RNA sequence: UACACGAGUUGUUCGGAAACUGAGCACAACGUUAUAUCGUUUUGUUAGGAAAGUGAAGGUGUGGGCCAUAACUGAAAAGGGGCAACAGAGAACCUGGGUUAUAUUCCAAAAAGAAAUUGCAUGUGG
RNA sequence: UUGCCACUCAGAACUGCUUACGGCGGGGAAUCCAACUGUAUAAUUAAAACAUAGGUUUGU
RNA sequence: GUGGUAAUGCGAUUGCCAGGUAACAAAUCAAUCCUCCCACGGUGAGCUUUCUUUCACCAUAAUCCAUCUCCGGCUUUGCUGGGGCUUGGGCCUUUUUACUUCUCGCGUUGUUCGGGGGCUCAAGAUUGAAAAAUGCAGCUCUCGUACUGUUUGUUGUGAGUUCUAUUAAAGCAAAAACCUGGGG
């Protein structure tokens, strides 16, 4: 249920004598036996997790984390990544550009892998059949197939009903609209083909 | 049954009107190749014991077992006889 | 006279666990379970998952009682590691301490 | 069941304390010595007149 | 030049697979019983365990022994190193022959040396354990 | 020379339209294609799972690329790393 | 059941097979060690 | 296959449990609720102090220690228990035969035999 | 170098049905609709409906 | 604990860590197994105006022991080692393949390994024990009574073994117990 490869990375447990085992999303290029470094003074090879305010600027970082410690949230689906834009050493916060254009500011002590998440280019191979969409979501959750609400009865959906399959009222619904009504284009601020 | 089994090993087998399934279903196509290719390899490993050079007169021809150019075990042995001679004739005319 | 047979035990299902058909000295042809022949002792899955030589594929009962030398060679890391994955582990355990104590100590 | 490949070790393990019975056997082409210990039966099959010898006493 | 006698190696690929062992007699080519390079060598099957510094007693003897083997190991089963022991390739390197009835007493002298040469401070490395 | 125009996609025949078959053919021909491993040297990478490439001859698993080995923006990323390591050190 | 036999009928018991009949009543078969004849107990116990 | 009476189901090893985990369940705690029979609950619980598995000095027959059981302490050790699979995992037995009806279940001592196996024991091997 | 352990096909004449278990596509030309396999009104509706891949949009 | 250059052989134990087994979808393909057939040879009953031989039976369980000798040496008194069964593997040692060679499988591939010996591995056969007094059964005679036979070879199909291809934006459970090792 994920296009990105998960790399099983083992570290040593700093305190006990074990070898703690860590499951991480794999930056593209990272292979079995690469000796990954994830600390403060870590080098910046393609896969290391050196801190975000210590990575050079204009660099390419995946698996960045918003809060300092949440263990990686952002830029973590396949092929996705963030570009570091600006450091503000007076504030101590880095402004990285999320893989949606929406560029935000995070603290300069967050951690971040170096590279692109594996499995890039998944979304470009077309499915060609309903059966290859069956097996995609059977590892993911249970939302397939999508019955159009306009093909439903006017008891089960706000669009359903009529002698023709038409949305009776404008599809763009309010941001404030109650759930069960907030269906269609939610708070659509720009509508339709550009 | 053994009256037919006696009369169906030497001759009087099925005919154009006794067949009911395709020839690739009666006598498979994938196993008349298989056997006929085991034989062209069971014969070339026989001929690395003491037969011809077996480096470039075996594997020049090991891929001709699987290239459908020999259509029988016999059909193979004249082709190595056509080449073994000038493999010892070019080794004869040499001055 | 072609007898058919039964699942003698109480499990009458054809799971990969049962897999039972032998003739009997009383000619009462009847079928018996097999053992599920386990894959043998292997190297770690990470390190090129391969069967170890000098080791048997004994089941939980054969393994729990047979001798210890039926499941391990007399090397170091025998029965967990193959000679390939020992000999490479001894030079890497030594070529590293060599490149260390010369390069961790070059500061007079 | 084990088959004693010995005349010394057999006469040792055959003269042990378990000795549930010693069933003298006559079969074609051999003569077989079934000692019944508590957990095995140890056989000593032989092709010689030594059968009738170690039959009287053993 | 590389495999001189008295030079310590690591016995790779054998029963003693990670042990440190010193070459005492190398060879080049034998006829039928050693087509391989034939460096006979004595080495450690029993490392002297760490001196506890606690109950200094006969237990320090029972835990500072050096058990010794002698094998003519092929050269592709060693790993030569930088070190030496200087264990008399010309004095001891000949009274340790390998023929039958010798591996009984010849083995107990290169053992009889490692007895004292560890009890004395000579190498302090050859008698550690190659941790792998 | 079987199947003169649409190749690997002969599995489908008339179905799925020409261009979806052709857009998916470019990506179906590469995931089955063996790639080169700067490790062993010889072409050995197969695609044991999406974004996962294994080299039997090399016995090591590189990660990355859904239908190729290295997405051609990792090709730029992989350099910018050392670009921003070496020149950013020396 | 073995202990009880020996405590009630001073005979040895080797194999005591039991079964809860389709009456809720537990039957018991009892081998008498081949040294206490069973036909000499049913005649004693009065079976 | 009705009615009546009488009988009939035999296991160290077969199935199940004792003894695995799965989807999942939810006792405790905790929270919430007028109220709970509510919710959280193994990809590890709980504002959260959740446990004898071991090692020991000392106690004890007796020529003060030879030797030995035992008490009662208490050595580190994070992540409370617990269910849920008669098709997953696991699981030490095979033939021969003498019931009106049971048998891998029964057979008694020329066990009709032959095995495997668990527990505790005495003892030959170091 | 001709010894022993193979029923498959090919051809020949020979004869005789132009009469022969069982099992076993009618085909072609078009128009319309849906692209397709798929699902679906258990007990009157299997469709041209749903799904679908694809396309786009919106929110984040 | 001790042997073999080495694959790895052999001998009689209590807590951490690391592995391993459990533990894996379906495919295609080659021997055991069993089913069936055929050629066998042997037994019983069937057909017979005829014509001929049709059909039945011929069995080997779990668990074990060791590869008999080819050979040292054809058994002196018997060593140097009691190794071997083969075909699929994985390796080991020793000598090589560069003029593109080569090794492959029915098959999508292996080398940058090619032969000679060895080390194991799991199928699997084999002798031996179980094991013939069993069992099937006919019999000469009269549940008694005895003994005469206690036979393997071929094919074909199959279930597992074999090789952790192919659909994969599908990559095709987990755990105990158990096992081995490092430290002990
Ligand atoms: Mg409404
Ligand atoms: Mg509305
Ligand atoms: Mg396995
Ligand atoms: Mg009734
Ligand atoms: Mg509750
Ligand atoms: Mg596995
Ligand atoms: Mg065949
Ligand atoms: Mg586990």
Tab-separated table of N, CA, C and O (backbone and C1' of nucleotides) in Angstrom, chain J residues 74-129:
chain	number	residue	atom	x	y	z
J	74	C	P	46.222	-60.475	-4.009
J	74	C	O5'	44.767	-60.956	-4.460
J	74	C	C5'	43.748	-60.011	-4.762
J	74	C	C4'	42.448	-60.343	-4.072
J	74	C	C3'	42.513	-61.410	-2.991
J	74	C	O3'	43.008	-60.930	-1.751
J	74	C	C1'	40.683	-61.853	-4.412
J	75	U	P	43.867	-61.905	-0.803
J	75	U	O5'	43.024	-61.963	0.547
J	75	U	C5'	43.298	-62.945	1.536
J	75	U	C4'	42.218	-62.973	2.587
J	75	U	C3'	42.235	-64.160	3.535
J	75	U	O3'	43.179	-64.020	4.580
J	75	U	C1'	40.031	-63.796	2.758
J	76	U	P	44.645	-64.650	4.417
J	76	U	O5'	44.829	-65.560	5.711
J	76	U	C5'	45.446	-66.841	5.623
J	76	U	C4'	46.871	-66.827	6.125
J	76	U	C3'	47.193	-65.787	7.199
J	76	U	O3'	48.143	-66.335	8.112
J	76	U	C1'	48.616	-65.470	5.342
J	77	U	P	47.664	-66.984	9.500
J	77	U	O5'	47.623	-65.746	10.500
J	77	U	C5'	46.510	-65.514	11.356
J	77	U	C4'	46.238	-64.038	11.506
J	77	U	C3'	45.491	-63.390	10.342
J	77	U	O3'	44.709	-62.303	10.840
J	77	U	C1'	47.624	-62.399	10.551
J	78	G	P	43.374	-61.830	10.078
J	78	G	O5'	43.451	-60.240	10.136
J	78	G	C5'	42.762	-59.432	9.194
J	78	G	C4'	43.692	-58.428	8.561
J	78	G	C3'	43.080	-57.481	7.537
J	78	G	O3'	42.461	-56.360	8.158
J	78	G	C1'	45.142	-58.362	6.730
J	79	C	P	41.800	-55.171	7.293
J	79	C	O5'	43.040	-54.308	6.777
J	79	C	C5'	43.303	-53.005	7.283
J	79	C	C4'	44.663	-52.930	7.935
J	79	C	C3'	45.443	-51.634	7.742
J	79	C	O3'	45.044	-50.609	8.640
J	79	C	C1'	46.861	-53.489	7.334
J	80	U	P	45.335	-49.060	8.309
J	80	U	O5'	46.777	-49.066	7.636
J	80	U	C5'	47.739	-48.069	7.948
J	80	U	C4'	48.193	-47.339	6.708
J	80	U	C3'	47.234	-46.289	6.166
J	80	U	O3'	47.333	-45.047	6.840
J	80	U	C1'	47.970	-47.670	4.395
J	81	G	P	46.135	-44.501	7.769
J	81	G	O5'	44.807	-44.823	6.944
J	81	G	C5'	43.530	-44.835	7.573
J	81	G	C4'	42.444	-44.403	6.617
J	81	G	C3'	41.054	-44.998	6.826
J	81	G	O3'	40.293	-44.404	7.866
J	81	G	C1'	41.630	-45.252	4.583
J	82	G	P	39.043	-45.195	8.516
J	82	G	O5'	38.491	-46.131	7.345
J	82	G	C5'	37.929	-47.409	7.616
J	82	G	C4'	37.415	-48.062	6.352
J	82	G	C3'	35.991	-47.726	5.938
J	82	G	O3'	35.893	-46.464	5.294
J	82	G	C1'	36.442	-50.050	5.609
J	83	G	P	34.629	-45.506	5.554
J	83	G	O5'	34.400	-44.770	4.159
J	83	G	C5'	34.995	-43.509	3.877
J	83	G	C4'	35.000	-43.223	2.395
J	83	G	C3'	33.697	-43.522	1.666
J	83	G	O3'	32.742	-42.479	1.748
J	83	G	C1'	35.450	-44.599	0.544
J	84	G	P	31.226	-42.809	2.176
J	84	G	O5'	30.769	-43.929	1.140
J	84	G	C5'	30.069	-43.590	-0.048
J	84	G	C4'	30.872	-43.927	-1.279
J	84	G	C3'	30.077	-44.312	-2.511
J	84	G	O3'	29.551	-43.197	-3.204
J	84	G	C1'	31.927	-45.774	-2.242
J	85	C	P	28.104	-43.312	-3.883
J	85	C	O5'	27.839	-44.884	-3.915
J	85	C	C5'	28.096	-45.667	-5.071
J	85	C	C4'	26.811	-46.228	-5.611
J	85	C	C3'	25.935	-45.227	-6.357
J	85	C	O3'	26.199	-45.171	-7.751
J	85	C	C1'	24.661	-46.300	-4.671
J	86	U	P	27.665	-44.918	-8.366
J	86	U	O5'	27.354	-44.149	-9.724
J	86	U	C5'	26.905	-42.802	-9.700
J	86	U	C4'	25.411	-42.706	-9.889
J	86	U	C3'	24.854	-41.312	-10.112
J	86	U	O3'	25.041	-40.863	-11.440
J	86	U	C1'	23.482	-42.489	-8.577
J	87	U	P	25.252	-39.301	-11.744
J	87	U	O5'	24.124	-38.971	-12.818
J	87	U	C5'	22.829	-39.553	-12.718
J	87	U	C4'	21.768	-38.498	-12.543
J	87	U	C3'	22.263	-37.059	-12.684
J	87	U	O3'	21.243	-36.273	-13.295
J	87	U	C1'	21.264	-37.337	-10.575
J	88	G	P	21.561	-34.785	-13.805
J	88	G	O5'	20.593	-33.879	-12.921
J	88	G	C5'	21.044	-32.645	-12.387
J	88	G	C4'	20.093	-32.095	-11.353
J	88	G	C3'	20.599	-30.885	-10.584
J	88	G	O3'	20.429	-29.671	-11.290
J	88	G	C1'	19.738	-32.465	-9.063
J	89	G	P	21.710	-28.802	-11.713
J	89	G	O5'	21.996	-27.897	-10.437
J	89	G	C5'	22.700	-28.418	-9.322
J	89	G	C4'	22.070	-27.995	-8.023
J	89	G	C3'	22.911	-27.081	-7.150
J	89	G	O3'	22.850	-25.726	-7.551
J	89	G	C1'	22.079	-28.840	-5.837
J	90	G	P	24.200	-24.927	-7.890
J	90	G	O5'	24.730	-24.470	-6.464
J	90	G	C5'	23.832	-23.985	-5.478
J	90	G	C4'	24.470	-23.999	-4.115
J	90	G	C3'	25.918	-23.551	-4.055
J	90	G	O3'	26.046	-22.141	-4.080
J	90	G	C1'	25.644	-25.522	-2.783
J	91	C	P	27.452	-21.433	-3.769
J	91	C	O5'	28.531	-22.425	-4.376
J	91	C	C5'	29.904	-22.272	-4.064
J	91	C	C4'	30.280	-23.074	-2.845
J	91	C	C3'	31.758	-23.386	-2.693
J	91	C	O3'	32.490	-22.318	-2.128
J	91	C	C1'	30.514	-25.356	-2.380
J	92	C	P	33.967	-21.996	-2.662
J	92	C	O5'	34.810	-23.260	-2.211
J	92	C	C5'	35.072	-23.510	-0.844
J	92	C	C4'	35.942	-24.725	-0.688
J	92	C	C3'	37.247	-24.704	-1.459
J	92	C	O3'	38.254	-23.952	-0.809
J	92	C	C1'	36.190	-26.800	-1.733
J	93	U	P	39.286	-23.080	-1.671
J	93	U	O5'	40.283	-24.160	-2.276
J	93	U	C5'	41.308	-24.720	-1.473
J	93	U	C4'	41.785	-26.048	-2.007
J	93	U	C3'	42.574	-26.016	-3.303
J	93	U	O3'	43.926	-25.642	-3.125
J	93	U	C1'	40.957	-27.726	-3.413
J	94	U	P	44.538	-24.428	-3.976
J	94	U	O5'	45.153	-25.131	-5.261
J	94	U	C5'	45.987	-26.268	-5.140
J	94	U	C4'	45.853	-27.186	-6.327
J	94	U	C3'	46.030	-26.555	-7.698
J	94	U	O3'	47.390	-26.374	-8.048
J	94	U	C1'	44.156	-28.006	-7.710
J	95	U	P	47.918	-24.943	-8.556
J	95	U	O5'	48.655	-25.269	-9.929
J	95	U	C5'	48.203	-24.720	-11.160
J	95	U	C4'	47.712	-25.797	-12.093
J	95	U	C3'	47.105	-25.322	-13.408
J	95	U	O3'	48.075	-25.059	-14.409
J	95	U	C1'	45.649	-26.880	-12.387
J	96	U	P	47.920	-23.782	-15.374
J	96	U	O5'	46.483	-23.960	-16.046
J	96	U	C5'	46.000	-23.003	-16.987
J	96	U	C4'	44.695	-23.425	-17.621
J	96	U	C3'	44.129	-22.442	-18.644
J	96	U	O3'	43.437	-23.154	-19.668
J	96	U	C1'	42.591	-22.703	-16.870
J	97	U	P	43.401	-22.577	-21.167
J	97	U	O5'	42.280	-21.442	-21.124
J	97	U	C5'	40.893	-21.769	-21.188
J	97	U	C4'	40.090	-20.700	-21.891
J	97	U	C3'	40.825	-19.385	-22.153
J	97	U	O3'	40.455	-18.851	-23.424
J	97	U	C1'	38.866	-18.966	-20.910
J	98	A	P	41.517	-17.973	-24.249
J	98	A	O5'	40.979	-16.474	-24.131
J	98	A	C5'	40.278	-15.861	-25.209
J	98	A	C4'	40.845	-14.504	-25.567
J	98	A	C3'	42.341	-14.323	-25.292
J	98	A	O3'	43.050	-13.676	-26.375
J	98	A	C1'	41.098	-12.654	-24.145
J	99	C	P	42.508	-12.437	-27.266
J	99	C	O5'	41.237	-12.986	-28.054
J	99	C	C5'	40.591	-12.190	-29.039
J	99	C	C4'	40.941	-12.657	-30.428
J	99	C	C3'	39.821	-13.346	-31.193
J	99	C	O3'	38.969	-12.424	-31.856
J	99	C	C1'	41.761	-14.690	-31.274
J	100	U	P	37.503	-12.872	-32.342
J	100	U	O5'	36.511	-12.103	-31.356
J	100	U	C5'	36.767	-12.007	-29.957
J	100	U	C4'	36.584	-13.334	-29.261
J	100	U	C3'	35.398	-14.168	-29.746
J	100	U	O3'	35.750	-15.550	-29.735
J	100	U	C1'	35.185	-13.764	-27.428
J	101	U	P	35.178	-16.541	-30.864
J	101	U	O5'	33.852	-17.130	-30.215
J	101	U	C5'	33.886	-18.294	-29.401
J	101	U	C4'	34.836	-18.143	-28.238
J	101	U	C3'	34.749	-19.213	-27.165
J	101	U	O3'	35.457	-20.388	-27.514
J	101	U	C1'	34.861	-17.070	-26.161
J	102	C	P	34.682	-21.658	-28.117
J	102	C	O5'	34.302	-22.520	-26.841
J	102	C	C5'	33.026	-22.384	-26.240
J	102	C	C4'	33.150	-22.018	-24.786
J	102	C	C3'	32.122	-22.639	-23.862
J	102	C	O3'	32.437	-23.978	-23.529
J	102	C	C1'	32.330	-20.340	-23.375
J	103	U	P	31.370	-25.149	-23.783
J	103	U	O5'	30.496	-25.137	-22.457
J	103	U	C5'	31.133	-25.085	-21.191
J	103	U	C4'	30.152	-24.906	-20.062
J	103	U	C3'	28.768	-25.485	-20.270
J	103	U	O3'	28.720	-26.890	-20.085
J	103	U	C1'	28.602	-23.327	-19.314
J	104	C	P	27.336	-27.676	-20.296
J	104	C	O5'	26.496	-26.689	-21.221
J	104	C	C5'	25.080	-26.748	-21.257
J	104	C	C4'	24.458	-25.849	-20.218
J	104	C	C3'	22.943	-25.862	-20.155
J	104	C	O3'	22.447	-26.958	-19.407
J	104	C	C1'	23.745	-23.629	-20.065
J	105	G	P	21.987	-28.310	-20.143
J	105	G	O5'	20.398	-28.291	-20.021
J	105	G	C5'	19.763	-28.405	-18.759
J	105	G	C4'	18.561	-27.501	-18.650
J	105	G	C3'	17.518	-27.625	-19.751
J	105	G	O3'	16.614	-28.689	-19.521
J	105	G	C1'	18.041	-25.350	-19.422
J	106	C	P	16.155	-29.650	-20.720
J	106	C	O5'	15.546	-28.659	-21.796
J	106	C	C5'	15.059	-29.155	-23.028
J	106	C	C4'	13.901	-28.336	-23.521
J	106	C	C3'	14.050	-26.832	-23.380
J	106	C	O3'	14.807	-26.255	-24.429
J	106	C	C1'	11.928	-27.495	-22.596
J	107	G	P	15.686	-24.938	-24.170
J	107	G	O5'	14.728	-23.995	-23.330
J	107	G	C5'	13.686	-23.290	-23.980
J	107	G	C4'	13.258	-22.097	-23.182
J	107	G	C3'	14.370	-21.428	-22.425
J	107	G	O3'	15.312	-20.746	-23.248
J	107	G	C1'	12.542	-21.688	-20.991
J	108	U	P	15.258	-19.179	-23.552
J	108	U	O5'	15.611	-18.528	-22.150
J	108	U	C5'	16.068	-17.195	-22.062
J	108	U	C4'	14.967	-16.277	-21.612
J	108	U	C3'	15.208	-15.532	-20.320
J	108	U	O3'	16.071	-14.424	-20.477
J	108	U	C1'	13.013	-16.400	-20.337
J	109	U	P	17.047	-13.989	-19.283
J	109	U	O5'	18.137	-15.152	-19.204
J	109	U	C5'	17.961	-16.263	-18.327
J	109	U	C4'	19.233	-16.637	-17.601
J	109	U	C3'	20.125	-15.469	-17.184
J	109	U	O3'	20.754	-15.791	-15.945
J	109	U	C1'	21.353	-16.948	-18.535
J	110	G	P	21.576	-14.680	-15.124
J	110	G	O5'	23.056	-15.272	-15.066
J	110	G	C5'	23.407	-16.214	-14.065
J	110	G	C4'	24.621	-17.033	-14.430
J	110	G	C3'	25.914	-16.279	-14.670
J	110	G	O3'	26.545	-15.850	-13.479
J	110	G	C1'	25.647	-17.924	-16.332
J	111	U	P	27.419	-14.504	-13.478
J	111	U	O5'	28.815	-14.947	-14.113
J	111	U	C5'	29.510	-16.089	-13.632
J	111	U	C4'	30.636	-16.486	-14.556
J	111	U	C3'	31.606	-15.378	-14.922
J	111	U	O3'	32.614	-15.215	-13.944
J	111	U	C1'	30.956	-16.548	-16.877
J	112	U	P	32.373	-14.273	-12.669
J	112	U	O5'	33.662	-13.350	-12.676
J	112	U	C5'	34.685	-13.593	-13.624
J	112	U	C4'	34.752	-12.479	-14.629
J	112	U	C3'	33.450	-12.096	-15.303
J	112	U	O3'	32.599	-11.343	-14.460
J	112	U	C1'	35.221	-12.098	-16.883
J	113	C	P	33.433	-21.603	-9.575
J	113	C	O5'	32.135	-21.489	-10.493
J	113	C	C5'	32.041	-22.226	-11.728
J	113	C	C4'	32.010	-21.283	-12.907
J	113	C	C3'	32.393	-21.893	-14.247
J	113	C	O3'	31.316	-22.585	-14.864
J	113	C	C1'	33.397	-19.748	-13.987
J	114	G	P	31.597	-23.940	-15.667
J	114	G	O5'	33.042	-23.702	-16.294
J	114	G	C5'	33.195	-23.391	-17.692
J	114	G	C4'	34.341	-24.170	-18.292
J	114	G	C3'	34.563	-25.570	-17.745
J	114	G	O3'	33.717	-26.539	-18.358
J	114	G	C1'	36.643	-24.435	-18.083
J	115	G	P	33.296	-27.844	-17.540
J	115	G	O5'	34.540	-28.824	-17.755
J	115	G	C5'	34.637	-30.070	-17.069
J	115	G	C4'	35.994	-30.706	-17.283
J	115	G	C3'	36.447	-31.748	-16.261
J	115	G	O3'	35.916	-33.048	-16.462
J	115	G	C1'	38.177	-30.200	-16.587
J	116	G	P	35.882	-34.118	-15.254
J	116	G	O5'	37.339	-34.080	-14.599
J	116	G	C5'	38.355	-34.987	-15.012
J	116	G	C4'	39.450	-35.146	-13.981
J	116	G	C3'	39.043	-35.696	-12.624
J	116	G	O3'	38.877	-37.102	-12.623
J	116	G	C1'	40.506	-33.861	-12.330
J	117	G	P	37.888	-37.790	-11.562
J	117	G	O5'	38.680	-37.714	-10.181
J	117	G	C5'	38.024	-38.014	-8.959
J	117	G	C4'	38.811	-37.545	-7.759
J	117	G	C3'	37.982	-37.153	-6.549
J	117	G	O3'	37.398	-38.242	-5.833
J	117	G	C1'	39.525	-35.449	-6.965
J	118	G	P	38.152	-39.040	-4.658
J	118	G	O5'	38.172	-38.022	-3.437
J	118	G	C5'	36.972	-37.449	-2.947
J	118	G	C4'	37.236	-36.169	-2.195
J	118	G	C3'	36.103	-35.699	-1.301
J	118	G	O3'	36.121	-36.344	-0.042
J	118	G	C1'	36.878	-33.890	-2.613
J	119	C	P	34.748	-36.744	0.680
J	119	C	O5'	34.216	-35.369	1.263
J	119	C	C5'	34.948	-34.658	2.244
J	119	C	C4'	34.278	-33.350	2.547
J	119	C	C3'	32.781	-33.428	2.769
J	119	C	O3'	32.439	-33.828	4.079
J	119	C	C1'	33.244	-31.698	1.251
J	120	U	P	31.537	-35.134	4.300
J	120	U	O5'	30.323	-34.603	5.177
J	120	U	C5'	29.029	-34.462	4.614
J	120	U	C4'	28.727	-33.029	4.264
J	120	U	C3'	27.278	-32.732	3.924
J	120	U	O3'	26.496	-32.509	5.080
J	120	U	C1'	28.691	-31.766	2.293
J	121	C	P	25.125	-33.306	5.296
J	121	C	O5'	24.128	-32.629	4.262
J	121	C	C5'	23.911	-31.231	4.273
J	121	C	C4'	22.989	-30.829	3.156
J	121	C	C3'	21.849	-31.786	2.887
J	121	C	O3'	20.782	-31.600	3.792
J	121	C	C1'	22.853	-31.138	0.846
J	122	A	P	19.956	-32.856	4.337
J	122	A	O5'	18.662	-32.862	3.423
J	122	A	C5'	18.154	-31.652	2.872
J	122	A	C4'	17.171	-31.933	1.768
J	122	A	C3'	16.331	-33.182	1.998
J	122	A	O3'	15.018	-33.012	1.480
J	122	A	C1'	17.591	-33.429	0.011
J	123	A	P	13.848	-33.968	2.017
J	123	A	O5'	14.178	-35.371	1.339
J	123	A	C5'	13.221	-36.052	0.548
J	123	A	C4'	13.514	-35.934	-0.928
J	123	A	C3'	13.339	-37.209	-1.723
J	123	A	O3'	11.985	-37.522	-1.973
J	123	A	C1'	15.323	-36.119	-2.398
J	124	G	P	11.372	-38.888	-1.399
J	124	G	O5'	12.342	-40.002	-1.989
J	124	G	C5'	12.402	-40.198	-3.388
J	124	G	C4'	13.483	-41.160	-3.804
J	124	G	C3'	13.675	-42.410	-2.969
J	124	G	O3'	12.672	-43.397	-3.149
J	124	G	C1'	15.772	-41.509	-3.508
J	125	A	P	12.632	-44.683	-2.180
J	125	A	O5'	13.766	-45.640	-2.760
J	125	A	C5'	13.677	-46.145	-4.085
J	125	A	C4'	15.010	-46.639	-4.585
J	125	A	C3'	15.577	-47.853	-3.875
J	125	A	O3'	14.998	-49.062	-4.331
J	125	A	C1'	17.272	-46.231	-4.133
J	126	U	P	14.697	-50.252	-3.298
J	126	U	O5'	16.149	-50.761	-2.893
J	126	U	C5'	17.060	-51.182	-3.894
J	126	U	C4'	18.428	-51.461	-3.332
J	126	U	C3'	18.468	-52.224	-2.026
J	126	U	O3'	18.127	-53.599	-2.120
J	126	U	C1'	19.991	-50.436	-1.914
J	127	U	P	18.832	-54.613	-3.151
J	127	U	O5'	19.437	-55.712	-2.180
J	127	U	C5'	19.040	-55.749	-0.819
J	127	U	C4'	20.229	-55.726	0.105
J	127	U	C3'	19.982	-56.240	1.507
J	127	U	O3'	19.978	-57.653	1.568
J	127	U	C1'	21.250	-54.243	1.601
J	128	G	P	18.914	-58.420	2.490
J	128	G	O5'	19.176	-57.824	3.941
J	128	G	C5'	20.390	-58.095	4.623
J	128	G	C4'	20.386	-57.502	6.005
J	128	G	C3'	19.056	-57.535	6.734
J	128	G	O3'	18.726	-58.799	7.276
J	128	G	C1'	19.996	-55.400	6.960
J	129	A	P	17.182	-59.169	7.506
J	129	A	O5'	16.820	-58.460	8.886
J	129	A	C5'	17.659	-58.622	10.022
J	129	A	C4'	17.410	-57.558	11.061
J	129	A	C3'	15.979	-57.419	11.533
J	129	A	O3'	15.599	-58.407	12.461
J	129	A	C1'	16.835	-55.288	11.082
